[PDB]
Every structure is written in C-alpha cells, then in structure tokens.
Amino acid sequence: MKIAIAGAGAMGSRFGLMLHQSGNEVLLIDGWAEHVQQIKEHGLQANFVEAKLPIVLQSVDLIILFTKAMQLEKMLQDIQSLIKKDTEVLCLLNGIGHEDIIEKFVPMENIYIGNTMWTAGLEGPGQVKLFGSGSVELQNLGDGKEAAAKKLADKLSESGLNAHFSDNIHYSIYRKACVNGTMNGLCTILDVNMAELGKTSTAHKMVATIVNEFAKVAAVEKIELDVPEVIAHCESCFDPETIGLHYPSMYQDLIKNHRLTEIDYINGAISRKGKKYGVATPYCDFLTELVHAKEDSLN
C-alpha cells in the first residue's frame, strides 16, 4: 500500500512509523514547518528507533487523518489533490462528528471512521515517545463497503496496530468520547493524573453525571449506551497498573505544551447537540467553559 498520513503529529507518527516498519510506503503530510524540516534532515526519531520517512508540507491509496480536530478542515482543503476516485479515507481522531466535514471532501463510499486506544507523545520537532499497547476499531460509512473495511482493518493489523471491524462504530465513538469527556477535562482542570483523580471522593459522581449526559444525547441518535459498562470503562483508567499514572492527552496538550484542546469536539459536541435535541447537558457545558477559561488563563 501507498499510504499518506495527513497529520503526522504524535499519533500520526505512531501509525506512520509502524506502517513503514512493516514495509509500506508511507508519506507523512504535516503543517508544522520545524517538525517537517527536522524530519527531512534527520528522519523521525522515536523511543519505542530512527526512520527517514518521506514528508511533505501541506501547502497514494490510503489517506489516514490524524490531525487535531481543529486543523482537520484546513488539512482536507490542502490535500484535496490526493483524494482520487480509488482513494480510501480513514479518520481515527478522538472527538465526535468528523464525518460531517470529511463528507464535504471525499465520496461517501471511501470514508471510514473509528477510534484507537493507542497512545503517543510528541516531545519536539521530529521526536516522539511511543508508550504502550493499543488497538483500533473502524467501520465504513459507505454503502455495502463492509468487506473493504475488513481488509483495511486487516492491512493495518498486519503492521501491529491490532485493528478490528465494527458494526456499531457510532456506539464505539460515543463510548470512547465518554472516556475523553471525563478523564481529559477533569485531569486538566484539577492538575492530576488519572490515578489521583479516581482516588478523590467525587470523581465517580462527576464521571457518572457526565456519562449520562452523553447517553441521553446518544439515545436521541438511536444509540443506547450501556451506561454502567461505559462508566466502568471510564473508571478503568484509574488503575495505576494500567494507565493510571499517565496524564491524559488533553492535560499534555494544554498544561504541558501550552496548546489548545479538542474540548469543543467532545464535551462541546455533546453540548451542541443538547441544544439541538433539547437535552440539558450542564456538566459538559461547564466543563467545556472551565477548560476554555483555563486555556485563556495560560494562552
């Protein structure tokens, strides 16, 4: 496979690299000049390791979207050239509702949305830390493309990304967004990692409240979350054995690297929909308002 990764940040770089290591032709596409230049010159360095991946500024058979949700539109705009008739598009971004923009730019038949449990940290231009284990879930939005989705899952799993087809996917995106709509904001705002958060006495109440707001909105979309499971899934992160000692990626984005979060595409999406469906979502509203206020307090 010839593969573009549009957004070879932290997570884009994880994937880019594992696909080039198993012997795909990987082309990274990024918007960050220094990262690019650095990688043209010295390759991509990682603590999983070096690899000279081809890389191009933004201004193949498979394109894999891995921008932040907020760059995503401009990135599409800047790569519409590579969106040909054959050409498959995969979103594994962490929020909710990316399909809507992706649709503007790529035929429905060719779009595949999903989730990943893989992690990754971008230490600096050209440099990444590649944490632990992981998995992928993905499904096709296009009519009767369930078979090519299973091949895409299969091609990816062959590079060790351990990916699976899903017949729900919107269940799975909501279920994961709940994890992103709790651990993230909470850790960010409270200045704690996940383990410390679950040690506090109100974490459970806060998590449950939030999960319910997510589930009432999803229900409107005919998507019925097993709320006790989803809650136990969010609470799973409290475990110091597993990921407990890590800070979630939103904390990293803002508190560690002084960059904006994806909060509008997670808890904020839930609010946008609460408005539209007439469902109260105050905890998402406030959590969103809190994170933006926190952004403003630092930049």
3-state secondary structure of 283: helix
DSSP string, 185-202: HHHHHHT--HHHHHHSSS
Side chain identity at 12, as an amino acid letter? G
State yes or no: 262 annotated in a binding site.
yes
CA distance 1 to 169: 25
The annotation status of 252 as a binding-site residue, yes or no, is no
247 binds a copy of itself (CB under 8 A): no
On whether the CB atoms of residues 170 and 269 are closer than 8 A, the answer is no
Region 177-206 residues binding a copy of itself, contact defined as CB under 8 A: 186, 189-192, 196-197, 199-203, 205-206
Tally of CB atoms within 10 A around 80 = 11
C-beta closer to ligand NAD: residue 90 or 149: 90
Residue 296 binds which entry of ligand NAD, a copy of itself, none, CB below 5-8 Å type-dependent: a copy of itself
Q: How far is the CB of 77 from a copy of itself (least distance, A)?
A: 25
Q: Which of 253, 121, 94, 135 is nearest to 187 (CA)?
A: 253
- Is residue 73 near ligand NAD by the rule CB under 6 A? no
If one asks whether residue 122 binds ligand NAD (CB under 6 A), the answer comes out as: yes
- Determine which one of 84, 129, 145, 176 is catalytic: 176
Which long-range contacts does 154-157 make (Cβ < 8 Å, 24+ apart)? Answer: 155/1, 155/62, 156/19
* Span of 16-24, 86-94, 173-181, 291-299 interacting with a copy of itself by CB under 8 A: 291-299
- Residue 172 binding target from a copy of itself, ligand NAD, none, CB below 5 to 8 Å by type: none
What is the CA 288 to chain-centroid distance, rounded?
Answer: 18
Binding flag, residue 9, ligand NAD (CB under 6 A) = yes
Per-residue binder mask for a copy of itself (CB under 8 A), 86-125, x = binder: ----------------------------------------
- 11 is known to lie in a ligand binding site: yes
Q: How far apart are alpha carbons 197 and 235 in whole angstroms?
A: 10
- Identify the DSSP state of 108: G
Contact flag: residue 116 with ligand NAD (CB under 6 A): yes
Q: Is residue 297 at the binding interface for a copy of itself, with CB under 8 A as the rule?
A: yes
Q: Is 24 annotated as a binding residue?
A: no
User: What is the Cα–Cα distance from 40 to 244, expressed in whole angstroms?
Assistant: 36
Indicate the residue among 59 and 201 with the shorter CB distance to a copy of itself: 201
Tokens of 297: 């307090």
Residues 194-253 that bind ligand NAD (CB under 6 A): 249
To the query of whether residue 85 is one of the catalytic residues in this protein, the response is: no
Q: Which is nearer to a copy of itself, 40 or 292 (CB)?
A: 292
Instruction: Work out whether 10 is an interface residue with ligand NAD (CB under 6 A).
Output: yes
Residues contributing to the annotated binding site for NAD(+)? 10-11, 30, 68, 71, 94, 120, 259, 262
Binding site for a copy of itself (CB under 8 A): 186, 189-192, 196-197, 199-203, 205-206, 209, 280, 282-283, 285-290, 292-294, 296-297
The catalytic site residues sit at 176
